[model samples]
Target: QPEPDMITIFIGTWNMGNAPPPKKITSWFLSKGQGKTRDDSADYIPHDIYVIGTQEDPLSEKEWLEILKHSLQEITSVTFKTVAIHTLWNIRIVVLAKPEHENRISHICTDNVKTGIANTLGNKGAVGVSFMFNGTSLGFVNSHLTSGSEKKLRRNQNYMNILRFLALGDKKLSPFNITHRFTHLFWFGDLNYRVDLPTWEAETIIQKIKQQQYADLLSHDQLLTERREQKVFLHFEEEEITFAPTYRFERLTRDKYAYTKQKATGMKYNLPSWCDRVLWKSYPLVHVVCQSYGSTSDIMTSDHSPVFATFEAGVTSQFVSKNGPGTVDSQGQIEFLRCYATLKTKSQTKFYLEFHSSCLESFVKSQEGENEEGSEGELVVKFGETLPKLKPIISDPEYLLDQHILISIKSSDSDESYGEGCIALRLEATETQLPIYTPLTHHGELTGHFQGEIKLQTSQ
Candidate 1:
C-alpha cells in the first residue's frame, strides 16, 4: 500500500468584539514577511483548507457568513468552496476547502453549548462541526469562555460542557467525542485564560518579554498551570509560545498594552494574557505536525489580537486516494448525463441537460470489442419527439465529450415528460450496425435508470 498523502491546513481565531470587518483582508492570508526583501526566509504557500472562527461578532449570521465567503474568494487565487458554516450567538465558524477535495467531505454535523448566565445566554459558549474528510474523521470547535481573572474554574467547566455537548451526536452520525471519534481535532477561540499575576508584576514581565525572556511569565499562565496541575486538556498539544501575549492590547496601536484603558475609563484591569489560542490532538494512526504558530499583529481592530496556526495531517494512503470507498472508480469509463437539472412549470417551461465524457479512450476500447469496424464512435440523444421539442444548443464533432451539450426543453403540455431520457453511442463501421446504448445512471450510479422530481409551486 502507498503512503497516504499529507494535507496542509490553516486555522485562525479572532475576537472581533462587534467590530466591522476590514475592507482588505488579503494580509490575513499572506505569509509573514511576504512581498518583502528576500533573505533565508521562504514564503509560505496557501494551504489545502482554511478554518476561521470569530467571537463577539455583531453582524447577523447571514451577513457574517457572507463576509467570510466573499473575503476568502477574493483573497486567495485558488478555487475554494465553503463546505460548512455554523454559528451560536456571537460565535461563528467557517470551513473552506479546495474544489477537488470538497466532494470528499461528508457527514457534516454541528452542535453548541451555552455556559453564560443561566446557561441560556450566548455570551459564553462553543460551536463545533464534525465531518469526514476523504475517509478520516475530523472535528473542529470554536469556543468563547467566561472572562475574568477569578473565573479560571468557570472557563474550565465551560470547556467540559462543550465536550459533553459535542459527544451527543446527531441522528445521522456517530458520537464525535474529540478524544475517541475523530482522527484529529482542533479547538480554538477566545478561551479567556488569564495570567495569574498582579498588574504591576505582569507589566514588569512584559518588559522582559521584549528582551526575549518570556519563560518566567509563561510559567504563570493560568491555562498552562491548570493543564499541568489540574489535568486539563489531557491529550491536547500546543506549540510553545515564542510570541508575546495576544490579549489586552490597545486598539490602533503598535505593541501598546491596554493598561491605559483602565486608568482613563476607571475600569478594572486584568493582567495581559495569551487569551487567544489554537490546540490540537490526533488518534494513534493519524499524525499531525505543526508548521507554524503565532499571532498576527497587523490586525488591531479588536482589543484582543488574532492568532493562527498551520498544520499538516498525514493519514493512511487508503483514506487519501480518490478511488476510496464510495467514490468513482479510478479506471472506469463513465459519462454523467446531467449532474444538475432545474425546471419551471408554465405555459412554456425551459430546462437544460448537461453531459460530460469521463474518458474518451474507454469508450473507444469498448466499441472495438463489440465488432465495430471503425475506431471512431458517434454520440446521439434518444428521446420522445412528440412530448417536447429538444434542441442541441452546443455540439462539436471533434470533441464531443469534452464540452457539455446544453439541451433546451420547451414544454406546452406536461411536466412529467421532461423527467426521463436516454443517450446512445452509434458506432459507424463499413455497414450500418445496431446503435450501442451506454448504460445510464443518475447521480453516479450504474442502475440503468435516472430518478428525479420536479418541484411544483402554484402561480399567483
Candidate 2:
C-alpha cells in the first residue's frame, strides 16, 4: 500500500451550560499529552490543527482564547495561531493551527446560520470556519441544535439550515456552497439528540452504567435511529460509541447523571444522553483515519462533558488554485453602520435603555458622555420617538449586538429597573424601520415587558 503525509487534527466540543470555567482545564485538551493516554511517549503524534467549539459559556471569548492558548502550549510546546473564530450568541467556534503550518492553510472564510427562534435570531445556531489546507478544502461547524427530547424534527431542520446557510448568506451557486466548496468538513456541538426510550426506561438503563450497559443505552439513541432510518445527517460519519453519554451530568461531580425532582422520593433523571458530539465526513477519495474518539471525565465545571475526536488525514493539494489566505476576515465581530431605537414606559415612565456586553464594559452613555449612578446609558428615548441615532462614529458597535439591554424605568427619586432582552441584527445590511416591543428579564425569571422599538443597520 502507498502512503501519503498525514496531518493529525484535534477537535473538541462542549456545552458549558452558562457555567464559569474552572481555573485549569488543560486536561480537556491534553488528550495525547502526558498523564492522559497510557501509551503516551515523547515520540507520540502531535496535532497539527485544533478546532474547539463551545456553547452557552458565560465568559467572554477573550477568556476562552487565553485558556485555549495556554492549554495548547502545555500539550506540545508549540505556538498556535487562531486562524478563524465565529460567535453567534452563546455558540462559538475557534480554529487554531501551529505557526509552522500556517503557510500551508489558505482561503480562511467564516460564516454562520441563524437557527434560533423563528430562524431570525441567533439564540440557537451554528458558526462555521473554512480553510484550504494543502489543497484539501476543509471546514468545521459548531452548532447548538433545537434542544428537546421530542424535537427531533426541528433538529433535522436545524441541521439542514446549517448546511444551506453556512457559506453564503444572501444566495449563491457554489465558494458560497459549504457542502460542495469544502471537500472535507466536520460538525460538532450540543446536537441535543436524546434517547428514544421513555423517562423511566432511560433512567433504568442509566443505573446500569456501572455495569457498562451503555451499549443498551446506545441502542435507544435517537441520533443513531434517525441516521439508520435515513431521516437526518445524510452523509456524515461517526465513530462507534466507546464512552458513556456526555450530557445531563451533575455539575462538580464525576461520572454522575443529573436528576430532577421526582414523585415524593424517587429521583427523576434527565435522560442521560450523548448530546455533545463530534462527527466528520469527506469525499470518497479523501483518506482519513480516526485515531481516537471519546469524552473526558476530569473536567466537571459544566453539566455536560466535553467530547473530542482526533484524526490523521493524508491529503494532497488536488487543485492548483493559487495558495494563501486570500482576503482574510475579522472572525465574527459585528460592525454596524448606524443604530437607533424608540423606547417608552407603559405609564410614560422615564426609562433608560442601557447597553452592556463583552464589547462594552458598561461605560454607560450620558450627557457628559459618561454614566452616573442615577442617569444610566444614553437617556434619549422619548415616548414612541426615535432615539438620537447611535452613529458609526461611536467607539464600540459590537456592544449593541449583545443579547440583552438593561431598561431602567423610574422617577427621578424612585429606584426601579428591568433587565435583559435581545436586539437581533440582520447580517446582510437590513434596515428595520418598524416598532418592536422587546421584553425584559431578570436574574431568575420575567413577566415584565419593556415597551420599545429599534432600528439597526449593519456593515456587511
Candidate 3:
C-alpha cells in the first residue's frame, strides 16, 4: 500500500437573488491570490476538488451546470472536470475534480428536500450529493433554509427534515442520517439565520465589525446559538469568522453594509446578517483541515457576498491505491459484489470454475498467492468424478461472499498413477500481471503429457 497525497478542496456558496450572472465567473473559481486581487505577494495554487453552491440562481439547472463546468475548465487550464451536479429550484450544487483523479470518484448520488409552504414547494430546500473518493465516502449538502429573523426554529426543522428524507441509494447505502453514513460531510448554503439582537444592539456589533472585532458578533449569531444549544448541526465544526457579515449589502457597493438604515426614498430598511456559510465534519479515520474561510467582497453582483473555504481532506493511507484492485476495504468491496459476479462456472466433459476476489483482503491475498510455508503457491481446483454441480456460493451471507474460491478436484489413489491425465491450472491476478497456479500430479512423476484443445465457456 502507498500513501495518498492530500486533496485540497475549495467550497463556495452564494445567494444570487436571481440577479444576472457574473460577466466573468472564472475569477470566482480561483483561489484568493490567483484572481484579480491586489495582493500579488501571496502565492497562487489550484485545488483538486471544487464544490460550489448557489441559492436563488436564475439559470436552468442544466444550463447553469454547463456554464460552471466550462468556466472551470477554461480558467483552470481544463484541469477540473465535473463529477456531480444537482439543483433544487434555485439552489444548485456542483462537484468537480481534477481529470486525472476523476475515475477514483464513484457512487455519485443526489437527493433534495423542499421545505417551503406546507414543506412541499421548492422555494426553500436542500440538495445533496454523496460519492466515494478513493476509499473515503463523502457527502455534500447545499441547502437554502427558511428565511427571516423569527424562523430560527423553522430552519432547525428544515435541517432535520433533510436528513430524514435524503437518500443516496437503497436503504443500505442511505443511513438513518448523514452523520452516520459518510466519512466526511459538508453542509453549505444560505442558511438564513439572522443576528439575535435589537436594531441598536446589532448596529453596535456592526461598529465592532468595522474595528476588526468580528468575533464579538458571533456571540449573537443565531446559527452559533443553535449550535451551542445542540439544537442543530451538532458535532459540526465551523471555521472562525474573521471576515465581516456576508448578507444584506446594497447591490454594487463594496463597503456599505445594508443595516436598518433609511431607504434612499423611504424609511424602511433590511437588517444586515450573516446568511451564507460552510461547515463540515469528518469521521475518525478521515480528517479535514481548514486553510482559509472568508467572504469575497469584490463580487458585488448579489446582495449576499459569496463565502468560500479551502480545506485539505486527509484520506486514510490504507484506502489509497495506485490503480491495482478496485476494492476499498470492506464497505466498497461489498458494493462491488452487488454489481459483479463472484464466480463463473463452465460445464463440459470437465467442469471449470473461475473465482474472483470480492473484497480488499481477499484480492490482496490472492495476489500474494503464497502458501503457509512462505513459498509461492497457486490456487488448485480439482473436479471429482461426478464433476460436482457448480453453484455460486454465498459464504458470508451477512457480508455477501467475503471470499470466492474455486472448488478443488478430488483424485483417487488409482488415478494418481503415471500416464493418467492430469489438469494443470493457471490463474492470473487482474490488474497485476501476476501468475497463480495449482499443480495436479500423477504419482509425482514427470511423465509424458497429453495435449488436447478444450473450449470452455463460463457464466458470471
Candidate 4:
C-alpha cells in the first residue's frame, strides 16, 4: 500500500451549560484564523473529519444532529457523513468524516461510563467511539466530570475511574488501555478542572487575564499540575493555549463572565476557568501536527464557550486507481531533489543540517558522490536568517504510506549527525503541500527535541 493522503481534522468541545442548541452554529466550524479575515480562505473548506462534543446539552441528540447537518450544509466543497453519534444523557459525542473516506473507516466500537453520583449517573459520565481509518486505529472520547474549584482530588479520581471503564470496541480497550493500542487517541470535553490560585479574588484574576498575565494563571492551573505530577493523562498532549478561559461566562453574552448585577459600582463575578479543553495522544511513528487551538468567544449561547483545534493527521493510503492494481509506484522511479525548513527557534542561531537518502540512500549533500541529482544539498539557515530550509534524499512519493523517505540532520561543521525524521509527500492539498513539518529524533528519549520545518521535493 502507498502512504495514505494526509488530511486535516477538526475537534471541538463545549460545556453549553444546558442551553438549547444555538440557532446559527455555522461559525463554530470555521477555521479559527481565517474565518474573520478571509471568506475564500482554504480553511473555509471543511476538515476531512470532525469530532464534536457538547456537555450539559439540554436538547435531544437528534435536534443537535439536525442543527449540525444544517450548518454543515452551509459550508462549501464537500458534505459529511456521521460515522457515530451517541448521547449519554447530558454529554454528546458526534463523529463525522467526508464521503471519500467512508469506505476507509471500519471496525467501529463504542461504550460509555458513569461516574456521576456513586458512579451511577449520566450527568457526569463519558461516551466514546473507536475505529480503523486508512490503516490507522483512532479513538475519540468525550467526557464531563465533577466541577468546582475545591473538587481537585475528586476530578483526578473521576478521570481515573472514567479511563478504567470507558472502553472502545476492542475487548482490552478502555481509555487507559486504548492509549497504548490506538495510533491516535483523542480525549476531550468539559473535564471541569478549575483555576487554583491562593488569595487572588475573581477581580484580581480577571485583571491578571486582561493584563495578559496568563503565565501566572497557567502555573496555578489544576490540569497542568496533574500532568506534571503524572496523576492523569501521563503522555497525552495538548496544544499551547493562547485563547482566554472558556468557562463561567454569562449566558446569551459574548466574552463576559457571569456577574451578579447589584449596584452600578459594585458587582460579583463567577470564577473564570478553562474548564473545557482538548487533548490527544499518538503512536510514535504516526506523526500528528496541530495547526490551531483557540476558543470561540463571539458566539455566547451558553455560560461556557466552545474550544476547537485543527490538525494535519496522517493515514496510510490504499491508493488503487480504478484502471489497475498499481501504476504510480510500480511504473515510476524517483530522483534526489531540494529540501526546505519551518524550524522555529526562540532566536536565530548559526546552525544547519545535511540530508543523506533515496531508497539506496543517495547522499543529497554528499560531495564525494558520483551521480546524486542535486547540488551540495546543504540545507542551511545562517544567523539573521528569517523564514528560510530539507536535508538530501529519494523515496516512494507515496513515500510515507508504508515506509517514509527517511533522512538525517547533522551539524555542517562537525559532520556529526544529531537527528532523523520522516517525510510525507503530497499532491495538491493546502494541508501538507509545501510547508509541512516532520519531527526528527535520534535513538534516545525523544530526540532531545529538535523541531524543524522540513520540505523534501521529489523529481520523479
Root-mean-square deviation of every model: 19.8, 17.4, 18.2, 12.5
Q: Which stretches of candidate 3 lie over 4 Å from their true place?
A: 1-3, 31-44, 116-122, 173-175, 261-269, 316-460
Q: lDDT of each prediction vs. the true structure?
A: 0.57, 0.62, 0.59, 0.62
lDDT of 4 by residue, 125-174 (tens): 88888887855678888989887677777777777776667777456211
Model number with the top TM-score:
4
TM-score of every candidate? 0.63, 0.64, 0.65, 0.65
Model 1 regions lying over 4 Å from their true place:
1-4, 31-44, 65-70, 73-75, 117-120, 167-176, 260-266, 317-460
Q: Candidate 2 on 48-83: residue-level lDDT in tens?
A: 888999999777889888888887787677778988
Q: What are the clashing pairs of model 1?
A: 4-317
- List model 1 lDDT by residue over 321-376, tens digit each: 23423343333222322122222222233323322122121111111001112123
lDDT of model number 4: 0.62
- Number of residue pairs clashing in candidate 3, backbone atoms closer than 3 angstroms, sequence gap of 3 or more or interchain: 4
- Show the colliding residue pairs in model 3: 378-437, 382-408, 382-409, 383-409
Ranking by lDDT: 4, 2, 3, 1
Candidate 4 lDDT for residue 239: 82
* Clashes (candidate 2): 0
Residue 383, candidate 1: how far off, in angstroms?
66
Residue pair clashes in candidate 2: none
